[PDB]
Design a protein around this ligand. Structure first.
Ligand code: FAD
Ligand code: COA
Length: 391
Protein backbone atom coordinates (compact mmCIF):
# COMPACT_ATOMS: atom_id res chain seq x y z
CA UNK A 1 0.00 0.00 0.00
CA UNK A 2 3.00 2.25 -0.63
CA UNK A 3 4.82 3.65 -3.67
CA UNK A 4 7.80 1.78 -5.13
CA UNK A 5 11.23 3.50 -5.14
CA UNK A 6 10.79 4.11 -8.87
CA UNK A 7 7.38 5.67 -8.28
CA UNK A 8 8.75 8.05 -5.65
CA UNK A 9 11.35 9.14 -8.18
CA UNK A 10 8.60 9.74 -10.74
CA UNK A 11 6.63 11.58 -8.07
CA UNK A 12 9.59 13.77 -7.16
CA UNK A 13 10.26 14.59 -10.82
CA UNK A 14 6.59 15.52 -11.28
CA UNK A 15 6.54 17.64 -8.11
CA UNK A 16 9.71 19.55 -9.02
CA UNK A 17 8.34 20.61 -12.41
CA UNK A 18 4.98 21.57 -10.91
CA UNK A 19 6.30 23.63 -8.01
CA UNK A 20 9.16 25.38 -9.81
CA UNK A 21 7.35 26.18 -13.07
CA UNK A 22 3.59 25.57 -13.02
CA UNK A 23 2.68 26.77 -9.52
CA UNK A 24 3.68 30.39 -10.20
CA UNK A 25 1.43 30.50 -13.27
CA UNK A 26 -1.77 29.13 -11.72
CA UNK A 27 -3.30 32.47 -10.72
CA UNK A 28 -2.68 34.16 -14.08
CA UNK A 29 -3.88 31.14 -16.06
CA UNK A 30 -7.18 31.41 -14.18
CA UNK A 31 -7.33 35.15 -14.87
CA UNK A 32 -6.57 35.02 -18.60
CA UNK A 33 -8.42 31.74 -19.16
CA UNK A 34 -5.73 31.17 -21.80
CA UNK A 35 -4.32 27.77 -22.77
CA UNK A 36 -0.78 27.71 -21.29
CA UNK A 37 1.24 26.76 -24.39
CA UNK A 38 4.54 27.42 -22.61
CA UNK A 39 3.65 25.13 -19.71
CA UNK A 40 2.48 22.39 -22.08
CA UNK A 41 5.84 22.52 -23.87
CA UNK A 42 7.65 22.04 -20.56
CA UNK A 43 5.20 19.26 -19.66
CA UNK A 44 6.14 17.51 -22.90
CA UNK A 45 9.90 18.00 -22.55
CA UNK A 46 9.76 16.44 -19.08
CA UNK A 47 8.17 13.35 -20.62
CA UNK A 48 4.86 13.69 -18.78
CA UNK A 49 2.72 13.40 -21.92
CA UNK A 50 1.69 10.09 -23.49
CA UNK A 51 3.41 8.20 -20.69
CA UNK A 52 1.36 5.05 -21.25
CA UNK A 53 2.23 4.88 -24.94
CA UNK A 54 4.40 1.85 -25.83
CA UNK A 55 8.17 2.34 -26.05
CA UNK A 56 7.99 1.17 -29.67
CA UNK A 57 6.25 4.42 -30.62
CA UNK A 58 8.26 6.72 -28.36
CA UNK A 59 6.25 6.30 -25.18
CA UNK A 60 7.52 5.43 -21.71
CA UNK A 61 5.16 2.48 -21.33
CA UNK A 62 4.13 3.55 -17.84
CA UNK A 63 1.12 2.37 -15.84
CA UNK A 64 -2.17 4.01 -14.92
CA UNK A 65 -0.89 4.39 -11.34
CA UNK A 66 2.24 6.13 -12.63
CA UNK A 67 0.12 8.75 -14.39
CA UNK A 68 -2.19 9.20 -11.38
CA UNK A 69 0.86 9.99 -9.25
CA UNK A 70 2.07 12.54 -11.80
CA UNK A 71 -1.39 14.02 -12.36
CA UNK A 72 -1.92 14.82 -8.67
CA UNK A 73 1.37 16.72 -8.40
CA UNK A 74 0.42 18.82 -11.43
CA UNK A 75 -3.05 19.49 -10.01
CA UNK A 76 -1.62 20.67 -6.69
CA UNK A 77 0.19 23.39 -8.64
CA UNK A 78 -2.44 24.17 -11.28
CA UNK A 79 -5.82 22.57 -12.00
CA UNK A 80 -5.43 23.39 -15.68
CA UNK A 81 -2.10 21.56 -15.87
CA UNK A 82 -3.75 18.72 -13.97
CA UNK A 83 -6.47 18.20 -16.56
CA UNK A 84 -4.02 18.61 -19.44
CA UNK A 85 -1.90 15.81 -17.99
CA UNK A 86 -5.04 13.64 -17.82
CA UNK A 87 -6.21 14.17 -21.41
CA UNK A 88 -2.67 13.82 -22.73
CA UNK A 89 -2.21 10.48 -20.95
CA UNK A 90 -5.66 8.95 -20.41
CA UNK A 91 -8.96 8.71 -22.28
CA UNK A 92 -8.88 9.18 -26.05
CA UNK A 93 -5.18 8.31 -26.30
CA UNK A 94 -5.94 5.22 -24.21
CA UNK A 95 -8.67 3.94 -26.53
CA UNK A 96 -6.47 4.55 -29.57
CA UNK A 97 -3.51 2.82 -27.92
CA UNK A 98 -5.62 -0.26 -27.15
CA UNK A 99 -8.00 -0.54 -30.11
CA UNK A 100 -6.32 1.52 -32.83
CA UNK A 101 -4.40 0.24 -35.84
CA UNK A 102 -0.66 0.79 -36.29
CA UNK A 103 -1.31 3.85 -38.46
CA UNK A 104 -3.82 5.30 -35.99
CA UNK A 105 -1.53 4.68 -33.01
CA UNK A 106 1.43 6.27 -34.81
CA UNK A 107 -0.57 9.37 -35.74
CA UNK A 108 -1.88 9.75 -32.19
CA UNK A 109 1.53 9.07 -30.64
CA UNK A 110 3.38 11.57 -32.85
CA UNK A 111 0.87 14.30 -31.98
CA UNK A 112 0.77 13.69 -28.22
CA UNK A 113 4.54 13.33 -27.94
CA UNK A 114 4.87 16.58 -29.91
CA UNK A 115 2.84 18.27 -27.19
CA UNK A 116 -0.76 17.94 -28.35
CA UNK A 117 -3.51 17.41 -25.79
CA UNK A 118 -6.13 15.26 -27.58
CA UNK A 119 -9.83 16.12 -27.46
CA UNK A 120 -12.55 13.55 -26.93
CA UNK A 121 -15.92 14.37 -28.45
CA UNK A 122 -18.89 12.53 -26.96
CA UNK A 123 -21.26 14.89 -25.16
CA UNK A 124 -24.07 16.73 -26.95
CA UNK A 125 -26.43 19.52 -25.80
CA UNK A 126 -29.27 16.97 -25.61
CA UNK A 127 -27.13 13.90 -24.91
CA UNK A 128 -25.02 13.95 -21.76
CA UNK A 129 -25.70 11.19 -19.24
CA UNK A 130 -27.60 9.36 -21.97
CA UNK A 131 -24.62 9.34 -24.34
CA UNK A 132 -26.21 6.52 -26.35
CA UNK A 133 -28.83 9.05 -27.48
CA UNK A 134 -26.29 11.16 -29.38
CA UNK A 135 -27.56 12.59 -32.68
CA UNK A 136 -24.16 13.06 -34.33
CA UNK A 137 -24.21 10.59 -37.21
CA UNK A 138 -21.63 9.10 -39.57
CA UNK A 139 -23.02 7.96 -42.92
CA UNK A 140 -20.88 5.59 -44.96
CA UNK A 141 -19.94 6.81 -48.43
CA UNK A 142 -17.61 4.50 -50.33
CA UNK A 143 -14.43 4.16 -48.29
CA UNK A 144 -15.31 7.27 -46.30
CA UNK A 145 -17.72 8.35 -43.58
CA UNK A 146 -19.63 11.64 -43.70
CA UNK A 147 -20.06 13.11 -40.22
CA UNK A 148 -22.87 15.49 -39.30
CA UNK A 149 -23.70 16.70 -35.80
CA UNK A 150 -22.65 18.81 -32.83
CA UNK A 151 -20.76 18.35 -29.56
CA UNK A 152 -20.26 20.73 -26.64
CA UNK A 153 -18.09 21.30 -23.56
CA UNK A 154 -15.25 19.87 -25.65
CA UNK A 155 -12.16 20.25 -23.48
CA UNK A 156 -9.35 21.58 -25.65
CA UNK A 157 -11.69 22.93 -28.32
CA UNK A 158 -9.71 25.34 -30.47
CA UNK A 159 -6.29 24.27 -29.18
CA UNK A 160 -6.43 20.48 -29.53
CA UNK A 161 -5.25 18.93 -32.79
CA UNK A 162 -6.10 15.26 -32.31
CA UNK A 163 -9.85 14.65 -32.10
CA UNK A 164 -11.69 11.46 -31.20
CA UNK A 165 -15.29 11.86 -32.33
CA UNK A 166 -18.11 9.52 -31.35
CA UNK A 167 -21.00 9.25 -33.80
CA UNK A 168 -23.92 7.01 -34.73
CA UNK A 169 -22.79 5.01 -37.76
CA UNK A 170 -25.27 4.45 -40.60
CA UNK A 171 -24.74 2.10 -43.54
CA UNK A 172 -27.03 2.89 -46.49
CA UNK A 173 -29.61 4.18 -44.02
CA UNK A 174 -29.30 1.20 -41.68
CA UNK A 175 -27.86 1.92 -38.22
CA UNK A 176 -24.68 0.07 -37.24
CA UNK A 177 -24.10 1.48 -33.76
CA UNK A 178 -21.75 4.07 -32.30
CA UNK A 179 -18.13 4.26 -33.43
CA UNK A 180 -15.13 6.53 -32.90
CA UNK A 181 -13.53 8.62 -35.64
CA UNK A 182 -10.07 10.20 -35.67
CA UNK A 183 -9.40 13.59 -37.25
CA UNK A 184 -6.67 16.21 -36.88
CA UNK A 185 -7.26 19.96 -36.68
CA UNK A 186 -4.66 22.46 -37.91
CA UNK A 187 -4.36 25.92 -39.49
CA UNK A 188 -5.47 24.58 -42.87
CA UNK A 189 -7.83 22.27 -41.00
CA UNK A 190 -10.19 19.52 -42.19
CA UNK A 191 -13.19 20.72 -44.20
CA UNK A 192 -16.38 20.44 -42.16
CA UNK A 193 -14.83 20.58 -38.70
CA UNK A 194 -15.89 23.85 -37.08
CA UNK A 195 -15.00 25.05 -33.58
CA UNK A 196 -18.14 26.45 -31.97
CA UNK A 197 -18.56 29.12 -29.30
CA UNK A 198 -16.54 28.92 -26.08
CA UNK A 199 -18.33 27.93 -22.89
CA UNK A 200 -16.72 29.98 -20.12
CA UNK A 201 -16.66 27.98 -16.91
CA UNK A 202 -16.69 28.41 -13.12
CA UNK A 203 -13.18 27.01 -12.71
CA UNK A 204 -10.25 25.31 -14.46
CA UNK A 205 -10.52 28.24 -16.86
CA UNK A 206 -7.12 27.56 -18.41
CA UNK A 207 -8.58 25.10 -20.91
CA UNK A 208 -11.17 26.27 -23.46
CA UNK A 209 -14.45 24.36 -23.39
CA UNK A 210 -16.24 24.85 -26.71
CA UNK A 211 -19.02 23.63 -28.95
CA UNK A 212 -17.96 21.59 -31.97
CA UNK A 213 -19.80 21.32 -35.29
CA UNK A 214 -19.52 18.76 -38.07
CA UNK A 215 -20.70 19.85 -41.52
CA UNK A 216 -20.20 16.94 -43.93
CA UNK A 217 -16.90 16.00 -42.29
CA UNK A 218 -15.24 13.49 -44.60
CA UNK A 219 -13.41 10.77 -42.67
CA UNK A 220 -11.63 7.92 -44.44
CA UNK A 221 -12.33 4.41 -43.12
CA UNK A 222 -8.68 4.08 -42.09
CA UNK A 223 -9.38 6.71 -39.44
CA UNK A 224 -12.33 4.89 -37.89
CA UNK A 225 -11.50 2.65 -34.94
CA UNK A 226 -12.67 -0.76 -36.14
CA UNK A 227 -13.55 -3.99 -34.34
CA UNK A 228 -13.67 -7.59 -35.64
CA UNK A 229 -16.91 -8.21 -33.71
CA UNK A 230 -19.02 -5.22 -34.75
CA UNK A 231 -19.62 -1.69 -33.47
CA UNK A 232 -22.35 -2.91 -31.13
CA UNK A 233 -19.72 -4.03 -28.63
CA UNK A 234 -17.37 -1.31 -29.88
CA UNK A 235 -19.28 1.42 -28.07
CA UNK A 236 -18.96 -0.69 -24.91
CA UNK A 237 -15.18 -0.98 -25.23
CA UNK A 238 -14.24 2.65 -25.96
CA UNK A 239 -15.83 3.85 -22.71
CA UNK A 240 -13.79 1.24 -20.85
CA UNK A 241 -10.82 3.44 -21.74
CA UNK A 242 -12.73 6.21 -19.96
CA UNK A 243 -12.40 4.22 -16.73
CA UNK A 244 -8.77 5.33 -16.67
CA UNK A 245 -9.83 8.91 -17.39
CA UNK A 246 -12.09 8.99 -14.33
CA UNK A 247 -9.27 7.89 -12.02
CA UNK A 248 -7.10 10.64 -13.50
CA UNK A 249 -9.92 13.15 -13.11
CA UNK A 250 -10.21 12.07 -9.48
CA UNK A 251 -6.49 12.68 -9.04
CA UNK A 252 -6.94 16.25 -10.28
CA UNK A 253 -9.72 16.82 -7.75
CA UNK A 254 -7.53 15.28 -5.05
CA UNK A 255 -4.58 17.43 -6.07
CA UNK A 256 -6.66 20.60 -5.82
CA UNK A 257 -7.95 19.55 -2.40
CA UNK A 258 -4.49 18.57 -1.14
CA UNK A 259 -3.09 21.97 -2.14
CA UNK A 260 -5.92 23.87 -0.44
CA UNK A 261 -5.44 21.61 2.58
CA UNK A 262 -1.71 22.37 2.85
CA UNK A 263 -2.37 26.11 2.44
CA UNK A 264 -5.14 26.11 5.03
CA UNK A 265 -3.03 24.24 7.57
CA UNK A 266 -0.10 26.61 6.99
CA UNK A 267 -2.42 29.58 7.53
CA UNK A 268 -3.81 28.25 10.81
CA UNK A 269 -0.28 28.13 12.22
CA UNK A 270 0.72 31.71 11.34
CA UNK A 271 -2.60 33.57 11.61
CA UNK A 272 -3.29 34.69 15.17
CA UNK A 273 -6.50 35.70 16.93
CA UNK A 274 -7.22 36.09 20.65
CA UNK A 275 -3.47 36.27 21.27
CA UNK A 276 -2.59 32.93 19.69
CA UNK A 277 -2.41 30.95 16.41
CA UNK A 278 -5.69 29.50 15.11
CA UNK A 279 -4.14 26.03 15.21
CA UNK A 280 -4.59 26.05 19.00
CA UNK A 281 -8.39 25.98 18.67
CA UNK A 282 -9.81 22.46 19.00
CA UNK A 283 -12.79 22.97 16.69
CA UNK A 284 -10.40 23.92 13.90
CA UNK A 285 -8.03 21.09 14.84
CA UNK A 286 -10.81 18.55 14.32
CA UNK A 287 -11.66 20.12 10.96
CA UNK A 288 -8.03 19.60 9.98
CA UNK A 289 -8.29 16.03 11.27
CA UNK A 290 -11.44 15.37 9.24
CA UNK A 291 -9.88 16.68 6.03
CA UNK A 292 -6.71 14.59 6.40
CA UNK A 293 -8.79 11.45 6.96
CA UNK A 294 -10.86 11.99 3.81
CA UNK A 295 -7.79 12.95 1.77
CA UNK A 296 -5.91 9.79 2.82
CA UNK A 297 -8.92 7.64 1.96
CA UNK A 298 -9.38 9.39 -1.38
CA UNK A 299 -5.75 8.81 -2.33
CA UNK A 300 -6.04 5.15 -1.37
CA UNK A 301 -9.25 4.74 -3.38
CA UNK A 302 -7.72 6.34 -6.47
CA UNK A 303 -4.46 4.39 -6.34
CA UNK A 304 -6.33 1.15 -5.61
CA UNK A 305 -8.62 1.72 -8.59
CA UNK A 306 -5.65 2.55 -10.85
CA UNK A 307 -4.03 -0.87 -10.39
CA UNK A 308 -7.31 -2.74 -10.85
CA UNK A 309 -8.74 -4.22 -14.04
CA UNK A 310 -6.76 -5.31 -17.09
CA UNK A 311 -5.77 -2.67 -19.64
CA UNK A 312 -7.95 -0.11 -17.87
CA UNK A 313 -9.10 0.20 -14.22
CA UNK A 314 -12.16 -1.77 -13.11
CA UNK A 315 -15.25 0.24 -14.08
CA UNK A 316 -16.79 0.08 -10.60
CA UNK A 317 -13.62 0.57 -8.58
CA UNK A 318 -12.93 3.60 -10.76
CA UNK A 319 -16.49 4.86 -10.30
CA UNK A 320 -16.23 4.43 -6.52
CA UNK A 321 -12.92 6.28 -6.40
CA UNK A 322 -14.14 9.11 -8.63
CA UNK A 323 -17.26 9.61 -6.48
CA UNK A 324 -15.20 9.65 -3.29
CA UNK A 325 -12.37 11.86 -4.58
CA UNK A 326 -14.60 14.46 -6.26
CA UNK A 327 -17.00 14.91 -3.34
CA UNK A 328 -14.03 14.94 -0.95
CA UNK A 329 -12.45 17.74 -2.99
CA UNK A 330 -15.56 19.94 -2.75
CA UNK A 331 -15.68 19.71 1.05
CA UNK A 332 -11.94 20.08 1.62
CA UNK A 333 -11.57 23.17 -0.59
CA UNK A 334 -14.59 24.83 1.03
CA UNK A 335 -13.41 24.08 4.58
CA UNK A 336 -9.85 25.16 3.79
CA UNK A 337 -11.23 28.46 2.49
CA UNK A 338 -13.01 28.83 5.83
CA UNK A 339 -9.64 28.76 7.60
CA UNK A 340 -8.65 32.00 5.86
CA UNK A 341 -11.84 33.79 6.86
CA UNK A 342 -12.57 36.98 4.93
CA UNK A 343 -9.31 36.71 2.97
CA UNK A 344 -10.48 33.27 1.82
CA UNK A 345 -13.34 34.99 0.03
CA UNK A 346 -10.92 37.42 -1.61
CA UNK A 347 -9.65 36.64 -5.11
CA UNK A 348 -6.17 37.83 -4.14
CA UNK A 349 -5.94 34.45 -2.41
CA UNK A 350 -6.15 31.12 -4.29
CA UNK A 351 -8.69 29.54 -1.93
CA UNK A 352 -11.80 30.70 -3.81
CA UNK A 353 -10.28 29.37 -7.03
CA UNK A 354 -9.77 25.95 -5.44
CA UNK A 355 -13.51 25.66 -4.78
CA UNK A 356 -14.30 26.81 -8.32
CA UNK A 357 -11.81 24.36 -9.87
CA UNK A 358 -12.91 21.37 -7.78
CA UNK A 359 -16.63 21.84 -8.46
CA UNK A 360 -16.57 20.34 -11.97
CA UNK A 361 -15.40 16.88 -10.98
CA UNK A 362 -18.76 15.66 -9.69
CA UNK A 363 -20.08 16.54 -13.15
CA UNK A 364 -17.59 15.98 -15.99
CA UNK A 365 -16.89 12.50 -17.34
CA UNK A 366 -20.01 11.09 -15.75
CA UNK A 367 -21.80 12.84 -12.90
CA UNK A 368 -21.63 11.58 -9.31
CA UNK A 369 -25.24 10.49 -9.82
CA UNK A 370 -24.55 8.39 -12.92
CA UNK A 371 -21.53 6.85 -11.18
CA UNK A 372 -23.72 5.89 -8.21
CA UNK A 373 -26.10 4.09 -10.56
CA UNK A 374 -23.12 2.27 -12.07
CA UNK A 375 -21.77 1.20 -8.67
CA UNK A 376 -25.27 0.12 -7.63
CA UNK A 377 -25.62 -2.02 -10.77
CA UNK A 378 -22.46 -3.86 -9.72
CA UNK A 379 -23.46 -4.46 -6.10
CA UNK A 380 -27.02 -5.45 -7.01
CA UNK A 381 -25.61 -7.39 -9.98
CA UNK A 382 -28.35 -6.21 -12.33
CA UNK A 383 -28.89 -3.84 -15.24
CA UNK A 384 -30.40 -0.52 -14.17
CA UNK A 385 -32.27 0.94 -17.17
CA UNK A 386 -33.28 4.60 -16.80
CA UNK A 387 -35.99 4.60 -19.47
CA UNK A 388 -39.71 4.46 -18.66
CA UNK A 389 -40.06 0.97 -20.15
CA UNK A 390 -36.84 -0.65 -18.94
CA UNK A 391 -38.42 -2.20 -15.83
C1 FAD B 1 -15.46 21.17 -17.29
C2 FAD B 1 -16.12 20.19 -18.22
C3 FAD B 1 -15.39 19.60 -19.24
C4 FAD B 1 -16.00 18.69 -20.10
N1 FAD B 1 -15.27 18.13 -21.08
C5 FAD B 1 -15.83 17.24 -21.94
C6 FAD B 1 -15.05 16.62 -23.03
O1 FAD B 1 -13.84 16.89 -23.19
N2 FAD B 1 -15.68 15.75 -23.84
C7 FAD B 1 -16.98 15.45 -23.69
O2 FAD B 1 -17.49 14.63 -24.48
N3 FAD B 1 -17.75 15.98 -22.71
C8 FAD B 1 -17.25 16.87 -21.83
N4 FAD B 1 -18.04 17.43 -20.81
C9 FAD B 1 -19.46 17.07 -20.69
C10 FAD B 1 -19.70 16.00 -19.63
O3 FAD B 1 -18.80 14.90 -19.77
C11 FAD B 1 -21.13 15.49 -19.74
O4 FAD B 1 -21.99 16.56 -20.12
C12 FAD B 1 -21.59 14.90 -18.42
O5 FAD B 1 -21.99 13.54 -18.63
C13 FAD B 1 -22.76 15.70 -17.89
O6 FAD B 1 -23.81 15.64 -18.85
P1 FAD B 1 -24.99 16.73 -18.87
O7 FAD B 1 -24.43 18.06 -18.43
O8 FAD B 1 -25.71 16.61 -20.18
O9 FAD B 1 -25.89 16.13 -17.68
P2 FAD B 1 -27.47 15.90 -17.81
O10 FAD B 1 -27.68 14.56 -18.48
O11 FAD B 1 -28.14 17.14 -18.33
O12 FAD B 1 -27.82 15.73 -16.25
C14 FAD B 1 -28.37 16.79 -15.49
C15 FAD B 1 -28.49 16.28 -14.06
O13 FAD B 1 -29.40 15.18 -14.06
C16 FAD B 1 -28.80 14.04 -13.45
N5 FAD B 1 -29.22 12.81 -14.15
C17 FAD B 1 -29.17 12.60 -15.48
N6 FAD B 1 -29.64 11.36 -15.80
C18 FAD B 1 -30.00 10.76 -14.64
C19 FAD B 1 -30.56 9.45 -14.25
N7 FAD B 1 -30.85 8.51 -15.18
N8 FAD B 1 -30.78 9.23 -12.94
C20 FAD B 1 -30.49 10.15 -12.01
N9 FAD B 1 -29.98 11.37 -12.29
C21 FAD B 1 -29.71 11.72 -13.57
C22 FAD B 1 -27.29 14.24 -13.56
O14 FAD B 1 -26.59 13.66 -12.45
C23 FAD B 1 -27.15 15.75 -13.56
O15 FAD B 1 -26.96 16.20 -12.22
C24 FAD B 1 -17.44 18.35 -19.93
C25 FAD B 1 -18.17 18.95 -18.90
C26 FAD B 1 -17.56 19.85 -18.04
C27 FAD B 1 -18.35 20.49 -16.94
C1 COA C 1 -23.43 4.28 -19.37
C2 COA C 1 -24.51 5.36 -19.38
C3 COA C 1 -24.52 6.07 -20.72
C4 COA C 1 -25.85 4.69 -19.14
O1 COA C 1 -26.09 3.77 -20.21
P1 COA C 1 -27.31 2.72 -20.15
O2 COA C 1 -28.44 3.28 -20.98
O3 COA C 1 -27.55 2.33 -18.71
O4 COA C 1 -26.69 1.47 -20.95
P2 COA C 1 -25.97 0.27 -20.14
O5 COA C 1 -24.95 0.88 -19.21
O6 COA C 1 -27.04 -0.65 -19.59
O7 COA C 1 -25.19 -0.52 -21.31
C5 COA C 1 -24.07 0.10 -21.93
C6 COA C 1 -22.94 -0.89 -22.19
O8 COA C 1 -21.72 -0.16 -22.23
C7 COA C 1 -20.86 -0.55 -21.15
N1 COA C 1 -20.28 0.64 -20.49
C8 COA C 1 -20.90 1.82 -20.29
N2 COA C 1 -20.08 2.70 -19.66
C9 COA C 1 -18.90 2.08 -19.46
C10 COA C 1 -17.60 2.43 -18.85
N3 COA C 1 -17.38 3.66 -18.32
N4 COA C 1 -16.63 1.49 -18.84
C11 COA C 1 -16.83 0.26 -19.37
N5 COA C 1 -17.99 -0.12 -19.94
C12 COA C 1 -19.04 0.72 -20.01
C13 COA C 1 -21.72 -1.36 -20.20
O9 COA C 1 -20.96 -2.41 -19.60
C14 COA C 1 -22.80 -1.93 -21.09
O10 COA C 1 -22.29 -3.13 -21.64
P3 COA C 1 -23.18 -4.46 -21.80
O11 COA C 1 -23.90 -4.24 -23.11
O12 COA C 1 -22.17 -5.58 -21.82
O13 COA C 1 -24.07 -4.45 -20.59
C15 COA C 1 -24.25 6.36 -18.25
O14 COA C 1 -24.48 5.71 -17.00
C16 COA C 1 -22.84 6.90 -18.26
O15 COA C 1 -21.97 6.37 -17.59
N6 COA C 1 -22.59 7.98 -19.00
C17 COA C 1 -21.96 9.15 -18.42
C18 COA C 1 -21.69 10.26 -19.43
C19 COA C 1 -20.32 10.09 -20.03
O16 COA C 1 -19.67 9.07 -19.82
N7 COA C 1 -19.87 11.09 -20.78
C20 COA C 1 -18.47 11.19 -21.14
C21 COA C 1 -18.16 12.50 -21.86
S1 COA C 1 -16.95 13.44 -20.90
Amino acid sequence: YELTPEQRTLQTQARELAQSVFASTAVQTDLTEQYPWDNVAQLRDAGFMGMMLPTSVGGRGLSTLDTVIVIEEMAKACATMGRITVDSNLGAIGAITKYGSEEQIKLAADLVLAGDKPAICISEPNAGSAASEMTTRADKNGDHYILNGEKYWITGGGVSKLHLIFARVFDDGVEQGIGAFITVLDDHGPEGLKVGRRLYAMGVRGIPETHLEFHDLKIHKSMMITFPDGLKRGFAALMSAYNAQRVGAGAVALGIAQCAFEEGVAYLKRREQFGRPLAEFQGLQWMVADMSVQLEAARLMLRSAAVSGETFPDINKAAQAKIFAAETANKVTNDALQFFGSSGYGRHNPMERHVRDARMFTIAGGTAQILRTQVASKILDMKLPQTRDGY
